[PDB]
Design a protein around this nucleic acid. Structure first.
Ligand SMILES: Cc1cn([C@H]2C[C@H](O)[C@@H](COP(=O)(O)OP(=O)(O)OP(=O)(O)O)O2)c(=O)[nH]c1=O
Ligand SMILES: [Mg+2]
Ligand SMILES: [Mg+2]
Length: 380
DNA sequence: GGGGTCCT
DNA sequence: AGGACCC
């Protein structure tokens, strides 16, 4: 019934770097964060470089790999919002997923375009891009026609993104978010594909690991592996009763639906972010004097970002990670502090954060943090 | 890794 | 405050 598109930018961070320094769009490029190559351009993947590879592995496997540092997300974040703002011009309800993916519900727009078409030009309606599984099109099938118009809009989207932002990316068009997202990566990079309904099963069964289904992550997949469940079909087939009584009703019914390619979740308007955070990770921080300096650094950046935003946060959170998950402490931001932008908001915010710090770190007893993070949320 | 979302 | 998910 619905016509949903999923847009997915090509090697996002690397693409941004290649644009900032066009002297790089010729070379294999990797974006580095500490010891990780979080992503690389397609010249690099040709040479054996994979996403999230160790710089050691990447170096050895590709000594001519140019590395740029991508620990500061400022520019990626800015381009990211330019992308969704551009998509919002097509339809106001755009849902972000991470920095480089967006869903848009095109069905109202598709409907509008059809109501305007004439008889002799419905003939006549064509696909833009790939048709998944080379499935043949039936122009008399109104579902095929709607999905085809979807593909046309999707191509207008990719064209605008290139023309206005210089950004290249993939699109997937299908009847729900799950399927749009699975199909958008079938032809990469910088291409698009549309999923006709009779090819839905082929798409879901094309997956080789149950983790490949968006919504099934490390923990959930590990549990399923424990239950003898490894293929999509194993999950499709497993006893709903037993599944429920091992993962709970909510998860069980949702992921089991997902395994059939069913996903009724609406595309949601993401809008402005609901939180701003900054982190730094390190081998060791073992003194409060360090912690405070670290935190002042993080807080400085955040205050810059809150500044531009316009809205004001009403709670602060401090996150740590002890040597060998994470722990957090939050509290509301005093009413008087919330009026800042010209004054000196630093010293009182660091005072609050340090109270939070000592609340979860015994400073009289040696400690070994390996991450510090500050988060502003409850924006108003 | 350096972010972000929602649910319990 | 933690846990799970997504990138
Ligand atoms: C998965 C993941 C992505 N990212 C960032 C790096 C990526 O540039 C960006 C989007 O990730 P992806 O969309 O998963 O991959 P990509 O856009 O870099 O490359 P492609 O889609 O062509 O395969 O998010 C992280 O920082 N940490 C992570 O764990
Ligand atoms: Mg991408
Ligand atoms: Mg998954």
């Amino acid at each position: 019934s619905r016509v949903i598109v999923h847009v997915d930018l090509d090697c996002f961070y690397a693409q941004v770097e290649m644009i900032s320094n066009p002297e790089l769009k010729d070379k294999p490029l990797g974006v580095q964060q500490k010891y990780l190559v979080v992503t690389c351009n397609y010249e690099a993947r040709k040479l054996g470089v994979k996403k999230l590879m160790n710089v050691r592995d990447a170096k050895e496997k590709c000594p001519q790999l140019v590395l740029v540092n991508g620990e500061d997300l400022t520019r990626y974040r800015e381009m990211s919002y330019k992308v969704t703002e551009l998509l919002e011009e097509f339809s106001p309800v755009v849902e972000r997923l991470g920095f480089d993916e967006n869903f848009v519900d095109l069905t109202e727009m598709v409907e509008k375009r059809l109501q305007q078409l004439q008889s002799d030009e419905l003939s006549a309606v064509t696909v833009s891009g790939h048709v998944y599984n080379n499935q043949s099109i039936n122009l008399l099938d109104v579902l095929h026609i709607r999905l085809l118009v979807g593909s046309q809009i999707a191509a207008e989207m990719r064209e605008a993104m290139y023309n206005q932002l210089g950004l290249t990316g993939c699109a997937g068009v299908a009847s729900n978010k799950l399927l749009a997202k699975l199909v958008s990566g079938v032809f990469k990079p910088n291409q698009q594909t549309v999923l006709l309904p009779e090819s839905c099963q082929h798409l879901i069964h094309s997956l080789n690991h149950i983790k490949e289904i968006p919504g099934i992550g490390y923990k959930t997949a590990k549990c399923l592996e424990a239950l003898g469940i490894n293929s999509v079909r194993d999950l499709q087939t497993f006893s709903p009763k037993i599944l429920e009584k091992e993962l709970g009703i909510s998860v069980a019914q949702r992921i089991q639906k997902l395994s059939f390619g069913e996903d009724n979740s609406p595309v949601i308007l993401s809008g402005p972010p609901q939180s701003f955070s900054e982190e730094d990770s390190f081998k060791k921080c073992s003194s409060e004097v360090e912690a405070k300096n670290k935190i002042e650094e993080l807080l400085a950046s955040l205050l810059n970002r809150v500044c531009q935003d316009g809205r004001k946060p009403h709670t602060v959170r401090l996150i740590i990670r002890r040597y060998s998950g994470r722990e957090s402490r939050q509290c509301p931001i005093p009413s008087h502090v919330i009026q800042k932008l010209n004054y000196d908001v630093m010293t009182p915010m660091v005072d609050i954060l340090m109270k939070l710090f000592r609340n979860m770190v015994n400073v009289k007893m040696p400690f070994h943090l390996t991450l510090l993070s500050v988060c502003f949320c409850n924006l108003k």
